[PDB]
């Protein structure tokens, strides 16, 4: 996050009288006098921009009030619970406060009311896969080993966009499942063809399962996408298993030539009852699963 | 500063520290990662380090929640090291990190087990369907190899074999034996069949191919279950 973090405080020592009611000083004068030592509790490694010079200013008013604006780029920790990935939502905190001074020495306050103190520029939103719904501003206390400190916090609420993973993982998995399901329509005697379907589709599902977590942290628990991939893997594996089953029951190696007549019960293998049931069952079971999964997982997170 | 001369000097520090990991039992390993603290120049005759508050000096370890590891325990140690120039103080803050296995179950173990189970399916196909059985065996072999390659690239080039390498090598051996089983059956039928007809648990009858397939259908899952039991018991 890139911010114009700006603070103000009253220092009676710097009271003066002169022509102008406000003195706009260079960044050096800020280093010449006392200023707060505010830091970010969850920050990791930020930089105060100094191009072309330190992006700082100081405005001393006649009554002694100061105004010390900065231009910071803070990159901070945002702990996440990726149980509902890629359909999760987060609240990334931004917590800041004094480092040296306890409650009795320095206390922070919001200039305007808490809701309207933190303002986000409309045009400024570099999020790619996320959506910034809003922010909640609050204040509180932290009791550390040294003492008690005031911590002023702003939680930015983010929601992920599912669009990337619909084509990255979900659509390839569903197409692979339907590709395996297509094997039911071919004749039973074409053993190499249906074996090719089974092995190749389960290979593809294994590849997708491996590549699904190419970006996530190596979390121990299983995400929603992992459950979806597992069920797709189960469906393709069941298709290959039932092909093996029906092949076990095939009697005559030769297929049906284009000149013969099949008597009813050189005879020929009848079309499998297993295939007849599966053609309508397996797609229906996949449809019911997909509807249940999407209905369950779309509507889980809170609202306003 | 304090009235009685006490001075407190605090610093928010982010530091990268070397933790030499022995990955022999990886990913079922526990790792001792330590942070050493010493005075640079002053000997122990000039400065003495200690932990304020005793064993309760270090705080915040319980609040740490790593995505992969879990901090089993932490330990503080104080001692003096006889450095080359002289005797110096030493403090050590050590953690025993234990790796979580669920991620490796989801990524590595489950596809390998499923591919071995897939390779077993070639025993339920007739001996004469060479195309189908060879497709099964070959496809399983390449899937095992590409899984192995996709795995081991994301690690240092350690010279020894890990636990995950042991599991993947075992799965590869099982798949290779599954394919060599069909090779044996085909050789027995089409290579030794006409010669035999012209000229003329206990092991099965090598002459009957159907007997070999029925025997394999029972032996391969049993052997794989035994191998899994031995592996998991040994490494856990």
């Amino acid at each position, epitope marked *: 996050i890139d911010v114009f973090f700006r603070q103000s405080w009253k220092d009676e020592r710097l009271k003066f009288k002169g022509p102008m009611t406000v003195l706009r000083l260079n960044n050096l004068m800020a280093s010449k006098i006392w200023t707060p030592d505010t830091f970010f509790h969850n920050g990791k490694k930020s930089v105060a921009h100094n191009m072309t010079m330190p992006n700082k200013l100081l405005r001393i008013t006649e009554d002694g009030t100061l105004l010390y604006t900065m231009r910071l780029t803070v990159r901070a920790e945002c702990p996440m*619970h990726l149980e509902d990935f890629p359909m999760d939502a987060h609240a990334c905190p931004l917590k800041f406060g004094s480092y040296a001074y306890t409650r009795a020495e320095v206390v922070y306050e919001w200039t305007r009311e808490p809701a309207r103190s933190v303002v986000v520029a409309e045009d400024g939103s570099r999020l790619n896969q996320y959506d910034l719904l809003g922010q909640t501003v609050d204040s509180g206390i932290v009791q550390s080993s040294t003492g008690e400190y005031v911590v002023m916090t702003t939680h930015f609420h983010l929601k992920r966009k599912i669009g990337y993973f619909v084509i990255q993982t979900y659509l390839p998995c569903i197409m692979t499942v339907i590709l395996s399901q297509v094997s039911f329509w071919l004749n039973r005697e074409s053993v190499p063809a249906r074996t090719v379907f089974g092995v190749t589709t389960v290979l593809t599902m294994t590849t997708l399962s491996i590549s699904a977590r190419n970006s996530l942290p190596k979390v121990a628990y299983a995400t929603a996408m992992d459950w979806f991939i597992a069920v797709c893997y189960a469906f393709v594996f069941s298709a290959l298993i039932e092909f093996a089953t029906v092949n076990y029951f095939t009697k005559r190696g030769y297929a049906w030539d284009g000149k013969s007549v099949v008597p009813e019960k050189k005879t020929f293998n009848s079309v499998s009852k297993i295939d007849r049931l599966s053609r309508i069952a397996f797609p229906l079971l996949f449809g019911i699963f997909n509807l249940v999964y999407w209905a369950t997982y779309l509507n889980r997170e809170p609202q306003l | 500063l304090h009235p009685d001369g006490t001075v407190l000097y605090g610093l928010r520090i982010t530091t990268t520290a070397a933790c030499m990991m022995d990955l022999r039992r990886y990913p079922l390993d526990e790792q001792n990662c330590t942070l050493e603290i010493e005075s640079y120049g002053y000997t122990t005759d000039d400065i003495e380090f200690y932990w304020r508050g005793g064993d309760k000096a270090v705080t915040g370890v319980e609040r740490i929640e790593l995505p992969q590891f879990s901090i089993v325990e932490h330990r503080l140690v104080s001692r003096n090291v006889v450095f080359a120039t002289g005797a110096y103080p030493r403090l050590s803050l050590s953690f025993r990190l234990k790796r979580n296995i669920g991620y490796f179950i989801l990524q590595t173990y489950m596809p390998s087990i499923l591919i071995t189970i897939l390779s077993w399916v070639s025993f339920w196909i007739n001996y004469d369907a060479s195309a189908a059985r060879v497709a099964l065996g070959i496809t399983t072999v390449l899937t095992m190899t590409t899984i192995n390659t996709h795995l081991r690239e994301t690690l240092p080039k350690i010279p020894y074999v890990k636990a995950i390498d042991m599991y993947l090598m075992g799965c590869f051996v099982f798949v290779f034996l599954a394919l060599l089983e069909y090779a044996f059956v085909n050789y027995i039928f089409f290579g030794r069949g006409p010669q035999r007809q012209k000229k003329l648990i206990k092991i099965p009858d090598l002459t009957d191919v159907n007997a070999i397939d029925r025997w394999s259908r029972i032996v391969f899952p049993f052997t794989f279950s035994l191998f899994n039991l031995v592996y998991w018991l040994y490494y856990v």
Partner: nanobody
Amino acid sequence: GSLRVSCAASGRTFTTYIMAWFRQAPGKEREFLAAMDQGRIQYYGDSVRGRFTISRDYAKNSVDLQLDGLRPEDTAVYYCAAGAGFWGLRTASSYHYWGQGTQVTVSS
């Protein structure tokens, strides 16, 4: 009077979740009391700022509330809640886990 209300979690590690207490006086109006983060940062409601003190024990996976200066209007059912604060940290809608609740009564 002084009191201490404890809450212990079982079946999930709430180290990274935000643990909070809520109050319900008779009248169906859930009131926020206090909350504590992974970062030990404490938030309070304006009605009980400095009277109640929230604390967490991460090793035992529990949250405690020390109540001081109990007044007769504080009689209510206190609930223990956990969950990451999404659109919340002061609203019951953001917490996906709740306690059974405990009745507390003050008689002068």
